[PDB]
């Protein structure tokens, strides 16, 4: 089935992954160098064996395509994926007045949830409405929207990296230079998340357009379900904006790890029988994907198994 | 055998690669997304089925480790690999006095060879001796020595990208951030070769150190034999300078192509029976690899088949 390379990659890390400590002081079971491919013409690979909310994928991808780095856009699409990183520059802030030394304390103490949630909804709210606050605690700076569409140049000017390569696909469909990169050597030593999705490159041969991701690091239970979808989505969109048909998404990993928290959750997923894969319908009369809205992308026939709850 | 993933990757591009035009207006047979791995503890993968001069590999890698971008160092190690790109800024030069509109004309007319060679040895020579000329026509600027060790920062300062990550391996052997990148979005639109070896990242688990290459583009007959060696060499060196043992080299491709010139040459190679793989002996009392010289790296027992001549 379309999603079987995931299940395979989750299995193989179980069966032969070696133990590895991490930045997080949770353990992991880990492998270096893996490649799964997905023939995007046989359907769309939103995993069926575990529910992955496509709505969350698309808003966040449309955030990136817009060159936006503000938690606000996300927030009016009921998308909280990036919420904690904005809250953090808030709880540290010199003018903060409310105790969140906070992610390490989610499950850790239930009575935190109350006043975490309270102080987190009290902040989401005020990003939504109060512009000064939003401009200040809601803008995440150097996350994929800037790297892709406004990469901070050395002359202080700003490069439209992704736009430029789409022109380049329109124009020189065959070059092997069709690279968008999110790895800024100038920024990775001191930056909240050095990007996991470090690079990708497009490729065109005889009608179809494919994309490969180099992902330096992959939480296989939480991160990879979303990650595969966002980047297969990206491929379709560009295929679309360029009039090409879609071919492959290739997912390449450096460190592909299962957290030790996630051991039971994965085995459970692994008993689930995957279901026929949904189809993606992009709106056939709009092409300038920098101009897509939620309704321009629709997912026919996703029939997932239930979500499996997971210690981040 | 150690080199069989090459022979496999050359075979697979024959048997199922699709036709593809290129920047060069030669044809190619081409595939997107491939991964071969090499267990560096079972020997060193200098291909045995075709002669690849290790001397050329090491001088050029020591050029890179030095942060050098001048054809001169290379030239005093009898290494002409990078020669043409320096000659080019010479033949264009406003003060040039000798007709080379030149690579498209190698085999094209034999009587060119005479006066190409003549005008090329006349230039190599004068890089070797005349410093002003060398500082000017011999320095290639933005090739791997600067990206790796002096990456041009936006404050006009210069980042020691590779040095920094080696410290980081010494210091945080487990992070999945151990990335050196050679892709400068600010520079790839107007730069002679946007780099083929776009990225790599190191990885450490339980004693061994591995490296993965993302190569955007690979001439499978000419480029890949050298490429695998240079990057397996890099892995050993860093394993060495960090006291780790060596584990894997993983070679990841975007566009892996066989030129149509190279069709006969490859089939021939494919009849050759590979031989047991040489061993690499790094000098066991020196560790600061930014300080290696040719004699600090030795190759026990390379027993190659003859070189196969090839239209670049
Ligand atoms: C799965 C995926 C993919 C891309 C980006 C993200 C995620 C994700 O789960 N999160 C995420 C969502 C929620 C929380 C929390 N709490 C922490 C991280 C992402 O930022
Ligand atoms: C194989 C390999 C690897 C890395 C870098 C290089 C090569 C190579 O053959 N050349 C090369 C050598 C000679 C010529 C010519 N003439 C053109 C290109 C490289 O610059
Ligand atoms: O889109 C994402 C973002 C983050 N992670 C995970 C991978 C790692 O387990 C974790 C920590 O990041 P690093 O240690 O690799 O920096 O974040 C993902 O899986 N997918
Ligand atoms: O180390 C190298 C450098 C260049 N090439 C080849 C790959 C392509 O066939 C050719 C042209 O480069 P691009 O078209 O990908 O830019 O150079 C290699 O194989 N190895």
XYZ file of N, CA, C and O in Angstrom, chain B residues 118-292:
700
model
N 49.554 23.501 -24.885
C 50.579 24.553 -24.864
C 50.138 25.737 -23.994
O 50.876 26.151 -23.095
N 48.935 26.258 -24.245
C 48.460 27.467 -23.558
C 47.982 27.177 -22.133
O 47.782 28.108 -21.339
N 47.819 25.888 -21.825
C 47.371 25.415 -20.505
C 48.562 25.117 -19.584
O 48.530 25.450 -18.412
N 49.608 24.503 -20.133
C 50.880 24.325 -19.428
C 51.633 25.651 -19.251
O 52.319 25.841 -18.252
N 51.485 26.556 -20.225
C 52.028 27.930 -20.177
C 51.378 28.757 -19.045
O 51.982 29.705 -18.529
N 50.149 28.377 -18.674
C 49.382 29.006 -17.591
C 49.590 28.336 -16.218
O 49.730 29.044 -15.221
N 49.590 26.992 -16.175
C 49.882 26.199 -14.957
C 51.201 26.631 -14.366
O 51.282 27.047 -13.214
N 52.233 26.502 -15.183
C 53.542 27.076 -14.950
C 53.505 28.442 -14.244
O 54.034 28.583 -13.142
N 52.888 29.437 -14.879
C 52.885 30.809 -14.354
C 52.010 31.023 -13.106
O 52.074 32.114 -12.501
N 51.170 30.035 -12.751
C 50.475 30.049 -11.456
C 51.494 29.609 -10.390
O 51.653 30.242 -9.327
N 52.206 28.537 -10.710
C 53.248 27.990 -9.859
C 54.294 29.005 -9.327
O 54.808 28.806 -8.226
N 54.573 30.083 -10.077
C 55.800 30.894 -9.910
C 55.593 32.395 -9.689
O 56.342 33.178 -9.088
N 54.577 32.880 -10.541
C 54.229 34.286 -10.576
C 53.058 34.440 -9.582
O 51.945 33.955 -9.821
N 53.321 35.077 -8.445
C 52.290 35.284 -7.423
C 51.106 36.178 -7.799
O 49.984 35.842 -7.447
N 51.326 37.311 -8.477
C 50.188 38.216 -8.837
C 49.113 37.489 -9.672
O 47.946 37.479 -9.283
N 49.532 36.877 -10.792
C 48.759 35.924 -11.638
C 47.961 34.835 -10.875
O 46.750 34.653 -11.093
N 48.664 34.122 -9.985
C 48.073 33.128 -9.082
C 46.991 33.706 -8.181
O 45.915 33.136 -8.061
N 47.267 34.842 -7.558
C 46.304 35.470 -6.661
C 45.024 35.813 -7.400
O 43.978 35.990 -6.765
N 45.121 35.842 -8.737
C 44.149 36.445 -9.652
C 43.492 35.411 -10.595
O 42.275 35.365 -10.700
N 44.278 34.583 -11.278
C 43.677 33.571 -12.174
C 43.659 32.153 -11.605
O 43.038 31.274 -12.184
N 44.289 31.959 -10.443
C 44.423 30.638 -9.827
C 43.537 30.360 -8.621
O 43.408 29.214 -8.187
N 42.941 31.416 -8.079
C 42.073 31.314 -6.919
C 40.635 31.149 -7.420
O 40.094 32.042 -8.064
N 40.021 30.007 -7.129
C 38.673 29.715 -7.627
C 37.511 30.284 -6.782
O 36.351 30.054 -7.109
N 37.808 31.003 -5.700
C 36.783 31.676 -4.915
C 35.910 30.731 -4.119
O 36.346 30.131 -3.156
N 34.661 30.614 -4.538
C 33.630 29.885 -3.810
C 33.593 28.400 -4.259
O 32.645 27.982 -4.923
N 34.628 27.622 -3.920
C 34.615 26.160 -4.088
C 34.795 25.622 -2.663
O 34.915 26.434 -1.749
N 34.825 24.304 -2.449
C 34.545 23.734 -1.099
C 35.418 24.225 0.035
O 35.075 24.114 1.215
N 36.567 24.771 -0.298
C 37.445 25.233 0.773
C 36.868 26.428 1.491
O 37.026 26.558 2.688
N 36.213 27.322 0.769
C 35.600 28.449 1.461
C 34.293 28.079 2.125
O 34.076 28.546 3.262
N 33.447 27.255 1.465
C 32.140 26.938 2.049
C 32.291 26.235 3.389
O 31.623 26.597 4.377
N 33.186 25.248 3.406
C 33.472 24.401 4.574
C 34.137 25.161 5.731
O 33.723 25.004 6.870
N 35.173 25.955 5.432
C 36.066 26.543 6.447
C 36.061 28.084 6.599
O 36.482 28.572 7.636
N 35.593 28.820 5.574
C 35.457 30.293 5.563
C 34.149 30.777 4.889
O 34.172 31.610 3.995
N 33.014 30.248 5.319
C 31.699 30.584 4.714
C 31.376 32.075 4.914
O 31.187 32.508 6.044
N 31.310 32.837 3.817
C 31.048 34.298 3.814
C 29.694 34.707 4.434
O 28.573 34.746 3.972
N 29.876 35.274 5.682
C 28.820 35.633 6.580
C 28.285 37.021 6.192
O 28.889 37.716 5.374
N 27.112 37.366 6.714
C 26.382 38.566 6.319
C 26.924 39.830 6.956
O 26.911 40.888 6.343
N 27.451 39.703 8.165
C 28.313 40.737 8.749
C 29.708 40.834 8.102
O 30.647 41.380 8.717
N 29.881 40.293 6.890
C 31.234 40.293 6.251
C 32.314 39.436 6.945
O 33.348 39.153 6.369
N 32.057 39.003 8.176
C 32.856 37.962 8.819
C 32.737 36.553 8.130
O 32.064 36.406 7.098
N 33.489 35.557 8.613
C 33.739 34.347 7.880
C 33.586 33.144 8.844
O 34.240 33.094 9.882
N 32.718 32.179 8.531
C 32.453 31.075 9.485
C 33.294 29.811 9.205
O 33.370 29.366 8.064
N 33.926 29.251 10.244
C 34.665 27.959 10.121
C 33.684 26.810 10.325
O 33.691 26.127 11.372
N 32.862 26.598 9.308
C 31.747 25.674 9.394
C 32.198 24.271 9.822
O 31.794 23.816 10.913
N 33.065 23.632 9.020
C 33.632 22.323 9.378
C 34.401 22.203 10.730
O 34.160 21.277 11.526
N 35.306 23.121 11.005
C 35.973 23.140 12.319
C 34.991 23.065 13.474
O 35.026 22.137 14.257
N 34.096 24.057 13.531
C 32.905 24.145 14.444
C 32.098 22.823 14.676
O 31.763 22.452 15.824
N 31.776 22.115 13.591
C 31.069 20.850 13.738
C 31.965 19.731 14.295
O 31.482 18.873 15.030
N 33.270 19.747 13.980
C 34.180 18.822 14.626
C 34.260 19.094 16.124
O 34.192 18.169 16.944
N 34.369 20.351 16.519
C 34.297 20.623 17.942
C 33.000 20.048 18.453
O 32.996 19.338 19.470
N 31.908 20.301 17.720
C 30.604 19.857 18.163
C 30.468 18.325 18.312
O 29.915 17.845 19.301
N 31.023 17.564 17.371
C 31.211 16.118 17.563
C 32.065 15.769 18.813
O 31.762 14.802 19.511
N 33.155 16.507 19.062
C 34.008 16.211 20.208
C 33.082 16.333 21.406
O 32.946 15.415 22.219
N 32.362 17.450 21.406
C 31.568 17.966 22.525
C 30.129 17.377 22.704
O 29.727 16.951 23.796
N 29.352 17.356 21.625
C 28.031 16.774 21.677
C 28.007 15.697 20.596
O 27.457 15.931 19.485
N 28.628 14.527 20.884
C 28.673 13.530 19.837
C 27.286 13.108 19.313
O 27.208 12.655 18.158
N 26.213 13.290 20.104
C 24.875 12.720 19.740
C 23.904 13.580 18.979
O 22.858 13.043 18.586
N 24.192 14.881 18.803
C 23.196 15.735 18.181
C 22.998 15.333 16.763
O 23.959 14.928 16.087
N 21.751 15.457 16.314
C 21.467 15.332 14.918
C 21.614 16.663 14.165
O 20.989 16.824 13.125
N 22.411 17.600 14.678
C 22.666 18.920 14.019
C 24.049 18.998 13.300
O 24.509 20.084 12.919
N 24.693 17.842 13.124
C 26.102 17.795 12.797
C 26.222 17.897 11.306
O 26.666 16.933 10.624
N 25.832 19.086 10.814
C 25.685 19.364 9.395
C 26.730 20.346 8.892
O 26.957 21.432 9.482
N 27.379 19.974 7.801
C 28.142 20.955 7.063
C 27.396 21.071 5.753
O 27.001 20.051 5.164
N 27.191 22.314 5.327
C 26.508 22.582 4.087
C 27.371 23.450 3.177
O 28.059 24.366 3.643
N 27.309 23.156 1.877
C 28.003 23.917 0.868
C 27.034 24.686 -0.077
O 27.455 25.174 -1.159
N 25.765 24.839 0.331
C 24.738 25.499 -0.549
C 24.330 26.900 -0.105
O 23.555 27.064 0.822
N 24.872 27.895 -0.781
C 24.643 29.260 -0.396
C 23.647 29.894 -1.318
O 24.003 30.269 -2.478
N 22.393 30.019 -0.823
C 21.269 30.540 -1.602
C 21.609 31.914 -2.216
O 21.252 32.168 -3.359
N 22.293 32.770 -1.449
C 22.873 34.057 -1.895
C 23.828 34.018 -3.137
O 23.997 35.042 -3.850
N 24.448 32.845 -3.346
C 25.489 32.588 -4.364
C 25.113 31.640 -5.470
O 25.609 31.798 -6.545
N 24.299 30.631 -5.231
C 23.961 29.690 -6.340
C 23.309 30.278 -7.648
O 23.530 29.739 -8.748
N 22.492 31.355 -7.554
C 22.031 31.870 -8.850
C 23.138 32.322 -9.796
O 23.015 32.050 -10.980
N 24.184 32.998 -9.293
C 25.322 33.409 -10.132
C 26.664 32.909 -9.561
O 27.369 33.624 -8.827
N 27.028 31.680 -9.904
C 28.255 31.063 -9.411
C 28.591 29.929 -10.387
O 27.694 29.208 -10.843
N 29.866 29.794 -10.738
C 30.303 28.838 -11.792
C 29.831 27.385 -11.607
O 29.099 26.857 -12.476
N 30.233 26.720 -10.516
C 29.453 25.526 -10.163
C 28.725 25.703 -8.834
O 29.362 25.764 -7.760
N 27.380 25.815 -8.909
C 26.608 25.552 -7.708
C 27.114 24.184 -7.285
O 27.253 23.338 -8.135
N 27.498 23.996 -6.009
C 28.115 22.731 -5.576
C 27.249 21.487 -5.711
O 26.111 21.493 -5.302
N 27.835 20.417 -6.249
C 27.201 19.090 -6.320
C 27.083 18.429 -5.000
O 26.120 17.712 -4.758
N 28.063 18.643 -4.144
C 28.045 18.008 -2.850
C 27.480 19.001 -1.911
O 28.208 19.801 -1.305
N 26.166 18.960 -1.800
C 25.486 20.131 -1.313
C 25.497 20.218 0.204
O 25.449 21.319 0.792
N 25.641 19.055 0.832
C 25.492 18.975 2.258
C 26.245 17.783 2.760
O 26.191 16.892 1.898
N 26.580 17.628 3.999
C 26.729 16.317 4.582
C 26.432 16.462 6.048
O 26.317 17.577 6.584
N 26.273 15.349 6.722
C 26.096 15.460 8.151
C 26.765 14.282 8.786
O 26.780 13.170 8.208
N 27.299 14.529 9.977
C 27.947 13.473 10.715
C 26.979 12.884 11.688
O 25.974 13.526 12.009
N 27.281 11.666 12.150
C 26.417 10.917 13.060
C 27.265 9.990 13.913
O 28.150 9.296 13.391
N 27.012 9.992 15.218
C 27.791 9.184 16.145
C 26.853 8.310 16.954
O 25.907 8.799 17.575
N 27.077 7.003 16.907
C 26.452 6.110 17.885
C 27.342 4.982 18.359
O 27.912 4.243 17.557
N 27.441 4.866 19.681
C 28.217 3.809 20.352
C 29.574 3.526 19.691
O 29.790 2.446 19.124
N 30.460 4.525 19.732
C 31.822 4.365 19.286
C 32.140 4.774 17.865
O 33.194 5.394 17.623
N 31.267 4.417 16.914
C 31.534 4.665 15.491
C 30.993 6.057 15.117
O 30.121 6.575 15.823
N 31.543 6.651 14.036
C 31.161 7.932 13.429
C 30.880 7.639 11.968
O 31.693 6.979 11.283
N 29.728 8.132 11.495
C 29.333 7.972 10.110
C 29.066 9.346 9.491
O 28.804 10.327 10.204
N 29.121 9.395 8.166
C 28.823 10.573 7.418
C 27.865 10.232 6.250
O 28.074 9.233 5.550
N 26.840 11.076 6.015
C 25.971 10.971 4.816
C 26.159 12.174 3.897
O 26.238 13.326 4.380
N 26.243 11.907 2.586
C 26.343 12.988 1.587
C 25.000 13.123 0.870
O 24.397 12.108 0.428
N 24.542 14.368 0.751
C 23.552 14.669 -0.224
C 24.261 15.240 -1.433
O 24.770 16.401 -1.364
N 24.296 14.446 -2.526
C 24.850 14.929 -3.783
C 23.719 15.238 -4.773
O 22.974 14.354 -5.180
N 23.582 16.527 -5.168
C 22.399 16.899 -5.935
C 22.413 16.245 -7.313
O 21.355 16.154 -7.919
N 23.565 15.797 -7.760
C 23.828 15.578 -9.203
C 25.085 14.656 -9.322
O 26.178 14.954 -8.871
N 25.073 13.634 -9.967
C 26.223 12.731 -10.030
C 26.504 12.122 -11.395
O 25.743 11.308 -11.881
N 27.606 12.522 -12.015
C 28.110 11.822 -13.161
C 28.597 10.501 -12.614
O 29.632 10.447 -11.927
N 27.853 9.439 -12.940
C 28.127 8.110 -12.394
C 29.427 7.447 -12.846
O 30.104 6.817 -12.028
N 29.777 7.588 -14.132
C 31.096 7.119 -14.624
C 32.297 7.975 -14.151
O 33.185 7.431 -13.530
N 32.335 9.282 -14.423
C 33.484 10.120 -13.974
C 33.442 10.537 -12.518
O 34.412 10.358 -11.801
N 32.323 11.113 -12.092
C 32.260 11.796 -10.814
C 32.187 10.909 -9.591
O 32.815 11.202 -8.554
N 31.443 9.819 -9.687
C 31.104 9.073 -8.497
C 32.288 8.250 -7.918
O 32.463 8.217 -6.691
N 33.104 7.578 -8.764
C 34.303 6.928 -8.215
C 35.115 7.819 -7.272
O 35.327 7.438 -6.109
N 35.500 9.004 -7.734
C 36.208 10.000 -6.894
C 35.400 10.431 -5.679
O 35.902 10.430 -4.528
N 34.155 10.824 -5.960
C 33.248 11.323 -4.918
C 33.071 10.428 -3.710
O 33.064 10.935 -2.558
N 32.922 9.122 -3.954
C 32.782 8.183 -2.884
C 34.100 8.195 -2.128
O 34.110 8.228 -0.901
N 35.230 8.149 -2.835
C 36.480 8.057 -2.101
C 36.677 9.323 -1.215
O 36.942 9.173 -0.005
N 36.467 10.530 -1.768
C 36.774 11.778 -1.040
C 35.995 11.841 0.246
O 36.526 12.253 1.293
N 34.745 11.393 0.180
C 33.880 11.500 1.330
C 34.061 10.332 2.282
O 33.886 10.492 3.499
N 34.458 9.160 1.804
C 34.844 8.123 2.792
C 36.160 8.571 3.464
O 36.365 8.438 4.668
N 37.032 9.177 2.685
C 38.247 9.682 3.287
C 37.907 10.690 4.389
O 38.388 10.548 5.499
N 37.033 11.653 4.107
C 36.641 12.673 5.100
C 36.158 12.076 6.453
O 36.554 12.551 7.539
N 35.327 11.031 6.355
C 34.752 10.275 7.481
C 35.906 9.693 8.342
O 35.965 9.878 9.569
N 36.831 8.985 7.707
C 37.967 8.420 8.429
C 38.691 9.496 9.177
O 38.901 9.381 10.380
N 39.043 10.570 8.478
C 39.810 11.637 9.097
C 39.173 12.191 10.354
O 39.867 12.344 11.365
N 37.869 12.471 10.305
C 37.135 13.071 11.416
C 36.970 12.013 12.541
O 37.118 12.341 13.709
N 36.636 10.759 12.183
C 36.653 9.605 13.114
C 37.962 9.641 13.892
O 37.970 9.445 15.138
N 39.045 9.948 13.151
C 40.417 9.915 13.644
C 40.700 11.102 14.578
O 41.206 10.932 15.671
N 40.373 12.301 14.122
C 40.597 13.498 14.862
C 39.701 13.560 16.103
O 39.876 14.461 16.946
N 38.737 12.632 16.209
C 37.780 12.644 17.330
C 37.920 11.412 18.170
O 37.246 11.284 19.196
N 38.770 10.497 17.696
C 39.114 9.285 18.439
C 38.027 8.255 18.325
O 38.040 7.240 19.003
N 37.062 8.497 17.462
C 35.976 7.527 17.308
C 36.443 6.474 16.314
O 37.313 6.727 15.519
N 35.860 5.295 16.357
C 36.003 4.392 15.257
C 35.078 4.789 14.077
O 34.145 5.579 14.205
N 35.347 4.237 12.908
C 34.577 4.559 11.743
C 33.425 3.549 11.614
O 33.532 2.382 12.034
N 32.299 4.013 11.081
C 31.127 3.169 10.819
C 30.739 3.329 9.364
O 31.411 2.813 8.491
N 29.705 4.096 9.070
C 29.274 4.128 7.689
C 29.440 5.439 6.907
O 29.511 6.552 7.463
N 29.540 5.275 5.605
C 29.432 6.388 4.693
C 28.139 6.073 3.978
O 27.923 4.913 3.531
N 27.254 7.056 3.916
C 26.048 6.866 3.140
C 26.001 7.876 1.998
O 26.184 9.096 2.211
N 25.838 7.377 0.784
C 25.889 8.256 -0.364
C 24.450 8.430 -0.952
O 23.823 7.451 -1.399
N 23.929 9.663 -0.915
C 22.557 9.909 -1.293
C 22.600 10.806 -2.468
O 23.300 11.810 -2.441
N 21.830 10.442 -3.485
C 21.790 11.153 -4.755
C 20.456 11.797 -5.029
O 19.408 11.252 -4.719
N 20.494 12.970 -5.618
C 19.326 13.486 -6.321
C 19.343 12.847 -7.691
O 19.004 11.687 -7.835
N 19.796 13.602 -8.680
C 19.933 13.168 -10.066
C 21.268 12.390 -10.268
O 22.353 12.988 -10.332
N 21.162 11.063 -10.338
C 22.285 10.175 -10.644
C 22.190 9.715 -12.110
O 21.351 8.850 -12.479
N 23.072 10.260 -12.939
C 22.990 10.056 -14.386
C 24.258 9.411 -14.989
O 25.387 9.652 -14.549
N 24.036 8.602 -16.013
C 25.080 8.153 -16.921
C 24.971 9.017 -18.163
O 23.928 9.027 -18.814
N 26.019 9.749 -18.500
C 26.042 10.362 -19.803
C 25.937 9.328 -20.909
O 26.341 8.176 -20.741
N 25.349 9.739 -22.032
C 25.261 8.868 -23.211
C 26.626 8.596 -23.888
O 26.771 7.552 -24.529
N 27.615 9.487 -23.713
C 28.987 9.190 -24.108
C 29.476 7.932 -23.409
O 30.270 7.155 -23.981
N 29.081 7.795 -22.139
C 29.712 6.845 -21.224
C 29.131 5.450 -21.243
O 29.538 4.603 -20.462
N 28.203 5.199 -22.144
C 27.560 3.896 -22.234
C 28.494 2.682 -22.448
O 28.333 1.668 -21.770
N 29.467 2.770 -23.355
C 30.339 1.612 -23.604
C 31.284 1.367 -22.452
O 31.487 0.233 -22.021
N 31.894 2.455 -22.007
C 32.802 2.463 -20.890
C 32.230 1.765 -19.641
O 32.913 0.939 -19.027
N 30.978 2.065 -19.292
C 30.340 1.474 -18.131
C 30.180 -0.045 -18.265
O 30.499 -0.781 -17.303
N 29.702 -0.505 -19.439
C 29.425 -1.939 -19.702
C 30.719 -2.687 -19.552
O 30.769 -3.773 -18.965
N 31.781 -2.084 -20.081
C 33.081 -2.699 -19.998
C 33.401 -2.890 -18.529
O 33.764 -4.001 -18.133
N 33.243 -1.820 -17.731
C 33.618 -1.842 -16.298
C 32.836 -2.967 -15.655
O 33.357 -3.755 -14.895
N 31.574 -3.057 -16.041
C 30.656 -4.042 -15.500
C 31.064 -5.504 -15.748
O 30.513 -6.386 -15.121
N 32.044 -5.767 -16.615
C 32.573 -7.138 -16.833
C 33.724 -7.484 -15.864
O 33.919 -8.639 -15.457
N 34.465 -6.514 -15.505
C 35.421 -6.535 -14.406
C 34.876 -6.984 -13.151
O 33.774 -6.602 -12.817
N 35.533 -8.022 -12.507
C 35.388 -8.703 -11.223
C 36.064 -7.923 -10.092
O 37.301 -7.779 -10.053
N 35.273 -7.367 -9.175
C 35.981 -6.523 -8.229
C 36.957 -7.313 -7.358
O 36.754 -8.506 -7.160
N 38.014 -6.642 -6.877
C 39.096 -7.252 -6.042
C 39.005 -6.839 -4.532
O 38.477 -5.757 -4.220
N 39.538 -7.662 -3.596
C 39.481 -7.256 -2.189
C 40.027 -5.848 -1.974
O 40.880 -5.345 -2.772
N 39.383 -5.146 -0.952
C 39.358 -3.702 -0.954
C 40.508 -3.216 -0.124
O 40.906 -3.850 0.863
N 41.072 -2.082 -0.514
C 42.258 -1.695 0.223
C 41.900 -1.227 1.646
O 40.727 -1.087 1.967
N 42.916 -1.025 2.478
C 42.753 -0.644 3.860
C 43.413 0.697 3.873
O 44.232 1.001 2.996
N 43.026 1.518 4.839
C 43.482 2.859 4.932
C 44.174 2.904 6.251
O 43.631 2.445 7.257
N 45.382 3.444 6.248
C 46.157 3.617 7.484
C 46.387 5.116 7.695
O 47.129 5.766 6.921
N 45.730 5.677 8.706
C 45.982 7.069 9.055
C 47.059 7.165 10.136
O 47.116 6.301 11.046
N 47.857 8.243 9.927
C 48.966 8.209 10.873
C 48.556 8.321 12.278
O 48.215 9.361 12.823
N 48.865 7.309 13.161
C 48.273 7.050 14.477
C 48.840 7.969 15.554
O 48.424 7.861 16.709
N 49.742 8.897 15.273
C 50.224 9.850 16.276
C 49.889 11.301 15.969
O 50.180 12.167 16.792
N 49.285 11.593 14.811
C 48.757 12.961 14.551
C 47.249 12.938 14.481
O 46.686 11.990 13.921
N 46.604 13.978 15.039
C 45.119 14.040 15.137
C 44.420 15.278 14.502
O 43.349 15.158 13.902
N 45.022 16.473 14.620
C 44.647 17.724 13.969
C 44.961 17.679 12.478
O 45.963 18.168 11.844
N 43.805 17.088 11.821
C 43.517 16.798 10.426
C 43.480 18.048 9.554
O 43.928 17.889 8.462
N 43.284 19.208 10.214
C 43.484 20.472 9.499
C 44.964 20.636 9.226
O 45.383 21.521 8.466
N 45.738 19.739 9.844
C 47.188 19.726 9.732
C 47.748 18.489 9.055
O 48.934 18.194 9.170
N 46.912 17.746 8.371
C 47.429 16.617 7.630
C 48.204 16.964 6.326
O 47.879 17.950 5.626
